[PDB]
Amino acid sequence: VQLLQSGPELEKPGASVMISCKASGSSFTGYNMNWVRQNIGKSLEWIGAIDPYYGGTSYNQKFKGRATLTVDKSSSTAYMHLKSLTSEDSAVYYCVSGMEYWGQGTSVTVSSAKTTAPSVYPLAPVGSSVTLGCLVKGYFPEPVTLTWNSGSLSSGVHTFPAVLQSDLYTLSSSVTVTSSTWPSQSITCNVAHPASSTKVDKKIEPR
């Protein structure tokens, strides 16, 4: 039993989103398709469910009149429509067959933000090890990729999850090396944000 969901969605406040869930393995019409979302914080909230043999629905009153569930039997696919979106709706949305088997989730981001390239800034100092970093500030949407020295520097790295704040994302990454390695050797962060055509190498220079 496998549930394939559609990819990430980005919407403005007040807009709608429509997500799909393609089911394979078991009998499509044998299980109610439930929908659940996972908020920032990891808490889970059940939205509703649909019977696919004839189409009856049950909603969490919280979403009643805002969410609409549908199915297409001819393609073993269930859909979730949610309208009047706000930032409270930014979440990962799962379909779940009989509450037994879960889809892989679909990310929905509700934001006023237009696509925006990050600004990439070096983090150099003002012991045995030295820690450097890179600050990837004010971009939209996710994702960004970051490496150090084209991936050759992998150990000693902490690349933090991005955070949405004031309708743009910021990420950072630290790298720690032996103090004998920098400033003598070269340390560069490699940042890509494909949505903005951004590909930046920022070499970390001593101040």
Binding site: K42, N60, L123, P125
Partner: peptide, 29 residues
Amino acid sequence: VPPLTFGAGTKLELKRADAAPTVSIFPPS
């Protein structure tokens, strides 16, 4: 039901020895 409800989640994580943070501060570029 409706609605089905969930607990907040319990994160099972690994134990290890206490370690002080390595703190590094950086000025603006």
